[PDB]
């Protein structure tokens with residue numbers, strides 16, 4: 001019969017939201033932060049342990065980086081604000097992404113090495129090495 | 136070693152030279168620091184000759200931790216320092232914030248298996264609804 005505070009425990013996904021912007025205006029929150037807050041579709045995570053309550057928030061940001069056909073050059077607009085002429089190929093066991101802009105070039109190689117994705121980014125001298133687990 | 140082997144979700148486990156590589160590209164300090172802090176999943180798709188590479192990034196903050204019935208100082212995401220109390224009274228979790236001679240109450244309550252969230256300030260009401268993920 002009775003609602004207890006422990007029943008509120010779990011992961012809650014936002015499905016509907018009405019009056020957010022008005023309410024934020026009443027608190028005196030700025031336009032940019034009102035809009036950004038009203039956009040996000042956060043998970044709410046509630047934990048109650050007897051009398052101790054914690055509320056947390058989870059936002060996942062999903063971006064398509066690029067979408068291409070292998071061996072066909074295409075214009076990429078990069079997160080740092082370059083417009084590159086790019087082409088991805090498959091040569092000698094590695095996915096090679098080649099970027100050209102403003103007389104410059106940068107390569108980004110992706111390969112498997114012991115069940116892990118090794119990403120190697122080169123620009124002039126400089127290598128950035130990133131490693132990922134399959135999940 | 137074929138291209139299809141790269142398909143799937145990947146989680147960043149190690150990064151080195153990130154800042155130097157970004158510096159070479161002529162990227163600003165803000166984006167460099169940020170980018171280096173981020174721990175994305177990488178999602179790779181390749182049906183034949185077409186390839187898609189997307190990412191996902193999650194955060195992950197604590198809004199507040201407290202003990203029912205005991206007052207505490209909340210620092211809010213908008214920049215209020217409030218005197219706050221949380222109670223479970225009348226079938227609902229009532230969060231009451233006080234600052235600068237003002238007050239707002241946030242009520243969380245289950246209806247029809249959903250979490251109904253009602254934020255009230257003066258007489259202006261935000262209503263948000265959540266579905267349980269399990």
Ligand SMILES: CCc1c(-c2ccccc2)c(-c2ccccc2)nn1-c1ccccc1-c1cccc(OCC(=O)O)c1
Nearest residue numbers: 065078079080119121128130153156170173175177188190
């Ligand atoms: C930092 C911004 C970024 C992301 C990204 C996205 C979200 C969170 C974190 C970082 C990516 C990306 C693209 C595709 C797949 C996975 C990551 N590229 N850049 C990027 C965008 C313009 C320029 C340079 C770089 C970049 C710089 C250093 C190392 C990189 O290594 C990519 C990898 O690890 O494969 C990529």
Ligand SMILES: CCc1c(-c2ccccc2)c(-c2ccccc2)nn1-c1ccccc1-c1cccc(OCC(=O)O)c1
Nearest residue numbers: 020037040042044055056057198211212213252254261263
């Ligand atoms: C920064 C905006 C925010 C979020 C939030 C965070 C991320 C994305 C979207 C919105 C939250 C929050 C807290 C707890 C759980 C889920 C969301 N509170 N504020 C917030 C922070 C200062 C002031 C007011 C409000 C706020 C405004 C409207 C509705 C709210 O109702 C919370 C709920 O729906 O339970 C809460």
